[PDB]
Design a binder for this molecule. Sequence first.
Ligand SMILES: Nc1nc2c(ncn2[C@@H]2O[C@H](COP(=O)(O)OP(=O)(O)OP(=O)(O)O)[C@@H](O)[C@H]2O)c(=O)[nH]1
Ligand SMILES: Nc1ncnc2c1ncn2[C@@H]1O[C@H](COP(=O)(O)OP(=O)(O)CP(=O)(O)O)[C@@H](O)[C@H]1O
Ligand SMILES: Nc1nc2c(ncn2[C@@H]2O[C@H](COP(=O)(O)OP(=O)(O)O)[C@@H](O)[C@H]2O)c(=O)[nH]1
Ligand SMILES: [Ca+2]
Ligand SMILES: [Ca+2]
Ligand SMILES: [Ca+2]
Ligand SMILES: [Cl-]
Ligand SMILES: [Mg+2]
Ligand SMILES: [Mg+2]
Ligand SMILES: [Mg+2]
Lengths: 439, 427, 348, 54
Amino acid sequence: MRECISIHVGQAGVQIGNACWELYCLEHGIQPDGQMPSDKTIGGGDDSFNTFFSETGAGKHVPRAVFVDLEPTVIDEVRTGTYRQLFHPEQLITGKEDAANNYARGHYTIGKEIIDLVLDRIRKLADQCTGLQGFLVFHSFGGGTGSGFTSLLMERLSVDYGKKSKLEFSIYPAPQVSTAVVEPYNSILTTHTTLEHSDCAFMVDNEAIYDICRRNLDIERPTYTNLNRLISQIVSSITASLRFDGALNVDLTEFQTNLVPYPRIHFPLATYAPVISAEKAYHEQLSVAEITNACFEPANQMVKCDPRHGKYMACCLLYRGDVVPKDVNAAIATIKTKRSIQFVDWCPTGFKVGINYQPPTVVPGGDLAKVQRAVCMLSNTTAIAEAWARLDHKFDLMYAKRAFVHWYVGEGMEEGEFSEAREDMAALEKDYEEVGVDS
Amino acid sequence: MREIVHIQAGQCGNQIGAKFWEVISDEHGIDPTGSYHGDSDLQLERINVYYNEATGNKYVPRAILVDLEPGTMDSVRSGPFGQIFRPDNFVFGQSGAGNNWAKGHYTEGAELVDSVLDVVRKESESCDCLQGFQLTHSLGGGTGSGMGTLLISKIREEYPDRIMNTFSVMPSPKVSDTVVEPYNATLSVHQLVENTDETYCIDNEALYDICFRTLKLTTPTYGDLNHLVSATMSGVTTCLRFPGQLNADLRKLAVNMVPFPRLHFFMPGFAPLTSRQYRALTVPELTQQMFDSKNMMAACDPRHGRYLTVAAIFRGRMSMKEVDEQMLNVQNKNSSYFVEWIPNNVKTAVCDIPPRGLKMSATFIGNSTAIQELFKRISEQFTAMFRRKAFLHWYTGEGMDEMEFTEAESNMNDLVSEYQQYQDATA
Amino acid sequence: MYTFVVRDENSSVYAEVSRLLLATGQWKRLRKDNPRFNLMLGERNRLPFGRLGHEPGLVQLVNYYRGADKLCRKASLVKLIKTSPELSESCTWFPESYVIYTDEREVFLAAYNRRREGREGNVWIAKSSEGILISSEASELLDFIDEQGQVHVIQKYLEKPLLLEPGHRKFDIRSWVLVDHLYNIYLYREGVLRTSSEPYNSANFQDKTCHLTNHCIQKEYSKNYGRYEEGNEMFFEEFNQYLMDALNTTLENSILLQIKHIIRSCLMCIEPAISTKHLHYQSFQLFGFDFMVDEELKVWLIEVNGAPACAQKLYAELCQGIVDVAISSVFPLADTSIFIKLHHHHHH
Amino acid sequence: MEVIELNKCTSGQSFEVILKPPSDPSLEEIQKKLEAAEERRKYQEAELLKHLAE
Ligand SMILES: Nc1nc2c(ncn2[C@@H]2O[C@H](COP(=O)(O)OP(=O)(O)OP(=O)(O)O)[C@@H](O)[C@H]2O)c(=O)[nH]1
Ligand SMILES: Nc1ncnc2c1ncn2[C@@H]1O[C@H](COP(=O)(O)OP(=O)(O)CP(=O)(O)O)[C@@H](O)[C@H]1O
Ligand SMILES: Nc1nc2c(ncn2[C@@H]2O[C@H](COP(=O)(O)OP(=O)(O)O)[C@@H](O)[C@H]2O)c(=O)[nH]1
Ligand SMILES: [Ca+2]
Ligand SMILES: [Ca+2]
Ligand SMILES: [Ca+2]
Ligand SMILES: [Cl-]
Ligand SMILES: [Mg+2]
Ligand SMILES: [Mg+2]
Ligand SMILES: [Mg+2]
């Protein structure tokens, strides 16, 4: 058994962290007070769930988690709500004034004054690990903390834990729920400084989650609570192999070797099915073939793009519920005859498959119906670069006039970091194109 | 980012300041004595942005009242909420400023300003995390204009890393006390361009026309003008006073609204326009009205320029689905008026508590390049007098040189040219 | 008010579509770079498909199918026909063709050799996506190809074309096909024959003005341009009358059935690759299919054009059909057909 | 279509299916960067306070 430390940065990262750890507790039978009756080794153990929870002598299962935010009101809701007993005060770190949607303010001005306290609280958890494998980092692209503090934190983790693996869950900006005009700036700035420090990054476009909630959950105007409960199910799908018995993606290193052959192209596309409203009175349960087919519908992806017009480098299917291999292979056979699935010439056309027999847990009273089987596909497709093209275009429009740039220069950032970051993104866009398109 | 320190200066600033504190005290369930008597905890969740807590469950506005005459502040002390203000926070002279920017900035106001900053300092020191300052004042008189901008300069010196926000009433010959108002306004704008982060331009021209044409008030009074101002002020501070996601503090507002440091003069709007009616307003009607030039408080034609950024705030129980749909319809059906080199430059907030006497309302805050019309207007009235050096002796008698007038005029004309730059820029 | 942007200034067809949209009073044109459009009349190269369909509150539609180039560039079209089971190497309506700069050069000469072996006519034509060589000498084919720069296809030249009389001349048929956002396939009921005005001479392939029926090369190099018809353009009423008078058949029976068959086959083949049925943006596109008819009244697909112009006397009618079935189908205006819908469901 | 590396347990199973074979900065550099930015902030502040003193 090797431990994983989760780090939640900023409003988006903290509130998504809330939803995930709630879901984890339901899935593992850990109560809000931290007690877990089914765990018969009291005060310790090296079970699979222990990769995410430590144990006290009193039988309390405590998340290996740090929450960081530069203002207190969002982490104060954790301190005060349903799972207040789960967490040790030392794991919840708040500042006084936030990064004002400004990457430079979160990275340079305010980051400098809190990075040491955070790394010390992270060292507290690392010290109670017999064999830490590394980190899972939740944050938004668009906020000032989520972008600016995270990239500083990522640089320092590479220094202080240079052997360890680092995975991201990143919220990509969507105007239907966005809070700032400058989110394209913050996004590009943080992708540039973080790219070398991340081993695998799962991007979630709020636009995709928003539309999945409207279309498939019948939510007229989704809130962050609607979005986060859906996101947490997907994160749970992705991390279940770290938390349960199995042989696929059992350590953070395997995510990189299964999904990322080229280190810079480390942004797998997630697709999840089925998403069914709990208020749907009559629902016909979907088969292995139907939920697997749905993994190739852009309308079910975490980022709207078109994988028919790129190429795959890897593909992993993560099933939860009543699934056996023969029905997976039958569904894959049919799907390959009917769909444009092109791999790069130097990778095998294939699928790594993981099945956990327990169907997805859903939050009581939440929006998602229980289903007998569900799947999350992780595919490294060059089509996800469509999202970088959208962001870089917005960035170009504002930066050509230097609109809002003075907010960043006034925090000590040099104007040239903007064009450095944007050139890096340009290199990234061209890497994706080399890999995924012929002449 | 919690506490705001509020300063009101001069006759106009104190009269609208008092009405502002009346209106938001009612929204927060605070009564004339500082006692809370409300039905919702949304009323108190962010009460400390504007109010201090004194023992006895008493809420005391974080408000400093400044004037060079005692007259208008005696009136505040006697008005309906006059008892709620902290008595030490009344800082007044006796001299008056004679509608004279030089007296407010350089002679009479210089005598009084250190005592004002003693009170500002004492309020700042009791702040867990001070966001900055809001000032209400006019630009056409002497105290609000000249001493107000003096205060802003001194506050920036002592707190250079906090946000400075003003509500600035622009003079108009239609609602006019003296002929020197264009001088005082031009000198003030010069200060505002350098030392505030966000300025709501409240045009006495627009407020008069709304009272005349729209609300069918034949002879508008300052009382009728200030009802429009206190309602607009309540609207533009909603995001600071209630829990919410968007523009919830002064610095995030500035980051969303100010793409270039000097271009920070905002055109506010309000819907539905009410005088001091029972028909319900639909979300489509709120949305068409808040964007209507006839609901703008700065007398500028929005079609004569382009929107750099817009902040919209909707108040009341209504459908957020319909709000988002209607906001999207405005931008998509008049897209040419929103600059295309700032994507998604329109941000929208909804708060469940409406203002008094309405079930639904909307407040508009636009950074339009059409605001240049306001400064061009002041600049023409300035020049018409200044080319004959008319009425200058009232200023040179206080130590000022003509060169200071020439510089302030030039800087304001530069501000006009910088707005015209971005109105034509295409991407 | 619907909105649209125009990003290909050089488009005869969409210049007219634009003007028609204006004249309805319900379509406002926007600046090239304004994102808040309903309709993109896009550029021909590197159209930013990735930026479409992410504008909240806007159904967006574009006049090109991402991926359609596989049909519309000659090398890809050969690859598509050879590698797709739904078309196959057995396909009866595409000429024998090979891609030459994988490369198929040795594959090419093995089939050429049984031509030499078989006393078969063995002239071939080499083309790329000016620069056309017809010759029964492989040596001169491959010689020609590489002192040019780019990829070429070698295709068997159809030695026995149908020749119109009077004139003993050549021709090709251009068909205009519109595919809408629902992937209905609409064949415009007017085609055009692009005629040669020179008599066809099987003995000199070095002279190409009687062998190449392109509207420019006849306006250019040929004595008799316009002798028989306006602009070397015979339309369908006259060509039908000729087929009745001379050959005792109709255009529908002898040629059009095959054309409709070929159009549906090609487009139903790439449908899974390019359909926008459940995409976040939608697509239509106008194609031009080019056909040749041999003397047995067998139709051959020549090439597919992704950005066709029209015949001048047909612009008005076609472009009104584009706005009718491709644009107003998605964006209705305030309160017979020129198209043949190609659909066929045989049960087996 | 070859299935390989099948592993089964009480909780589930995993396998692979093939359709077709294959055809950092130091701490000191960081604290340098955060200190250069802090000095640029203090310079802008001193220039403002110089101008306000004039
Ligand atoms: N999916 C999801 N997105 C969120 C959530 N909260 C914020 N976001 C998105 O994240 C971006 C805003 O960044 P935040 O995380 O709120 O900002 P922050 O990290 O707290 O940084 P500062 O407040 O600027 O100090 C916008 O694009 C939001 O829509 C959330 O709970 N769930
Ligand atoms: N196998 C073949 N047999 C006989 N003629 C052929 C032929 N292949 C091409 N041609 C002739 O070539 C000419 C068209 O060449 P090509 O297909 O390259 O058109 P093009 O792309 O240059 C112009 P456009 O795309 O506008 O129609 C026709 O006149 C046709 O008769
Ligand atoms: N809207 C509004 N404008 C006012 C009010 N009182 C004065 N003014 C305007 O303010 C300017 C005169 O300044 P004033 O505040 O009276 O002088 P001060 O006391 O020296 O600061 C003129 O433009 C008046 O039109 C008021 O109560 N409301
Ligand atoms: Ca245990
Ligand atoms: Ca590393
Ligand atoms: Ca004195
Ligand atoms: Cl290490
Ligand atoms: Mg925050
Ligand atoms: Mg007065
Ligand atoms: Mg003193």
